[PDB]
Design a protein around this ligand. Sequence first.
Ligand SMILES: OC[C@H]1O[C@@H](O[C@H]2[C@H](O)[C@@H](O)[C@H](O)O[C@@H]2CO)[C@H](O)[C@@H](O)[C@H]1O
Ligand SMILES: OC[C@H]1O[C@@H](O[C@H]2[C@H](O)[C@@H](O)[C@H](O)O[C@@H]2CO)[C@H](O)[C@@H](O)[C@H]1O
Lengths: 132, 132
Amino acid sequence: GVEVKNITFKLGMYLTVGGVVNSNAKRFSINVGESTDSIALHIDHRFSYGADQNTIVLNSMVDDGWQQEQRSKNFPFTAGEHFQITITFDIDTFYIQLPDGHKVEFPNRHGDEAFNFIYLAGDARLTFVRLE
Amino acid sequence: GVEVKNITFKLGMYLTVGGVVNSNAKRFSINVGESTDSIALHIDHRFSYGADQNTIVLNSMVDDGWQQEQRSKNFPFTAGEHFQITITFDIDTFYIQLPDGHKVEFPNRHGDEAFNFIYLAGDARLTFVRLE
Ligand SMILES: OC[C@H]1O[C@@H](O[C@H]2[C@H](O)[C@@H](O)[C@H](O)O[C@@H]2CO)[C@H](O)[C@@H](O)[C@H]1O
Ligand SMILES: OC[C@H]1O[C@@H](O[C@H]2[C@H](O)[C@@H](O)[C@H](O)O[C@@H]2CO)[C@H](O)[C@@H](O)[C@H]1O
């Protein structure tokens, strides 16, 4: 998927990602961190991934190893349709605004103040990234 | 600055890049191609870079070697202020729409139907990328 590197996404900023879910999507993720092996925030939108049907799975990855999962069954996503998601954070917590007023919080496990890497993976097409 | 890798920019698509020019900018470039070293379209916005004052320099880079330059004196950019440009192409030509709505042309020297890499260099910061 699309990898955005050498950006500065730090305290007090927001990041919005727009995309269109593919027609027969299985899943797509948005990822914020340092690299494909260091991810502070993985938001996996699972349409049908094993036992996870219309479920968001959140995690972090450290040295290419997945940590402890969190799940949400609020799933305002539809195959073939546009979405926007907005992320902000402080040293404690990521705040994720999903479509249709849904919201998920996920811990900022290392208390990082800035990230340099954003990555959209799987069954969605990027339409835009806005960061300020 | 920002590198965007594995972006799918094909014939028929419009790539818009937006951001803010540094307050005492000397130059910044938007680059479309395959990597830092492999650029089909380099658009260098030169406020002040040697003999180029308020000049756009366009070129391509093959295997880390610059090719033949082209210049334009249409320069609707201001240090410290926002900018946005929209890039399109067919198999022959790139079309670059500047902030005042006017277009500059540059040859598609390799006659490619898709590119996969964008990056910004220099005295500006990216705040937005869109594909439509
Ligand atoms: O945690 C995100 C990570 O999940 C992996 O799949 C997990 C699965 O979610 C879980 O239920 C099972 O117990 O373990 C699997 C392997 O850790 C995905 O493979 C990976 O791509 C991420 O999405
Ligand atoms: O061609 C784009 C390339 O230009 C380099 O600068 C050139 C300059 O434009 C030219 O007038 C002079 O003769 O040579 C310089 C060095 O080749 C930039 O340094 C490079 O970053 C690109 O912008």
